[PDB]
């Protein structure tokens with residue numbers, strides 16, 4: 001699995017065990033990602049914060 | 061299949077016969093979705109109204 | 121004059137020359153306005169879009 | 181007064197009436213600005229959201 | 241003079257004799273401030289410990 | 301093993317080979333740790349930095 005990240009080169013390969021791509025944003029400002037990378041379990045979203053997780057190459 | 065929605069808790073399980081997730085927005089205003097949920101047939105887009113459809117959990 | 125908006129901080133002071141607040145809604149999705157802001161002339165409503173205008177702080 | 185903004189050219193001149201530069205961030209992620217520009221009054225911060233305001237050229 | 245601090249409500253008014261605001265961080269960890277408040281003399285930095293000092297409201 | 305961290309989401313699963321959780325604190329600012337994470341060997345404390353290590357989920 002390959003996922004997008006914030007800084008150049010903008011992509012990376014995930015380690016064994018981290019099999020999800022994720023993106024964190026402010027729910028009120030969906031166009032600016034704050035964190036972007038590989039993870040093992042999807043974190044809990046809240047009213048103000050959203051975590052999106054997916055498992056297809058460069059889906060995040 | 062689970063899809064994102066506008067009302068708390070912000071997700072729902074789709075009923076029998078809806079096998080896609082979707083999002084509806086106005087051209088040049090991508091940060092304000094006006095419709096978000098489960099659907100049967102993906103609608104056709106026009107100059108002002110844009111639709112996106114997908115088939116994995118909370119992809120919309 | 122100060123009007124409501126859909127993007128943070130959810131309020132805005134209008135420039136001199138814009139003395140009305142407004143709301144814009146698409147007929148295809150009547151429960152969710154696509155824009156809230158300041159304007160100089162209230163636009164005529166059409167077959168696809170409805171407009172509502174008012175003149176006091178946070179009326180829209 | 182001149183202030184920084186998010187997209188290229190990364191700077192701009194403020195209108196008359198907007199005499200403060202601002203930056204909005206998630207309190208837990210101080211290195212990624214979500215919004216950046218000119219404003220008239222500083223918005224209220226909260227536990228999760230911080231607004232920083234200043235009035236010297238390119239202070240934000 | 242008002243300065244930012246780590247404890248809620250996240251700001252304080254400085255007492256007589258403290259005419260500067262400051263922030264203390266470790267090199268390569270700018271997102272975790274370990275000290276933040278009002279001060280008299282700005283301390284000298286070293287290889288691992290970095291200090292910044294300023295003189296306008298909530299500049300730190 | 302799962303350890304606490306200072307950056308969102310405030311928890312992390314350690315890679316195979318890292319079987320301890322730790323906390324790092326500078327003697328110049330004893331009330332605020334600068335880092336929390338996973339490690340393989342607990343480092344010796346020095347004149348400037350103190351280290352604490354433990355072996356169970358979210359102990360650090």
Ligand SMILES: [Cl-]
Nearest residue numbers: 016017018316
């Ligand atoms: Cl593994």
Ligand SMILES: [Cl-]
Nearest residue numbers: 025030050120
């Ligand atoms: Cl979103």
Ligand SMILES: [Cl-]
Nearest residue numbers: 036037038039
């Ligand atoms: Cl990552």
Ligand SMILES: [Cl-]
Nearest residue numbers: 014015018038
């Ligand atoms: Cl990784």
Ligand SMILES: [Cl-]
Nearest residue numbers: 061062073074
């Ligand atoms: Cl399901």
Ligand SMILES: [Cl-]
Nearest residue numbers: 074075078098
């Ligand atoms: Cl449905």
Ligand SMILES: [Cl-]
Nearest residue numbers: 103104105106
């Ligand atoms: Cl057609």
Ligand SMILES: [Cl-]
Nearest residue numbers: 087106107108
């Ligand atoms: Cl077009």
Ligand SMILES: [Cl-]
Nearest residue numbers: 087088107108
């Ligand atoms: Cl066009």
Ligand SMILES: [Cl-]
Nearest residue numbers: 121122133134
């Ligand atoms: Cl006003």
Ligand SMILES: [Cl-]
Nearest residue numbers: 134135138158
């Ligand atoms: Cl305008």
Ligand SMILES: [Cl-]
Nearest residue numbers: 126151152153
């Ligand atoms: Cl609304």
Ligand SMILES: [Cl-]
Nearest residue numbers: 156157158159
């Ligand atoms: Cl407007």
Ligand SMILES: [Cl-]
Nearest residue numbers: 134135138158
């Ligand atoms: Cl306007």
Ligand SMILES: [Cl-]
Nearest residue numbers: 136196197198
């Ligand atoms: Cl003016």
Ligand SMILES: [Cl-]
Nearest residue numbers: 205210230300
């Ligand atoms: Cl900050």
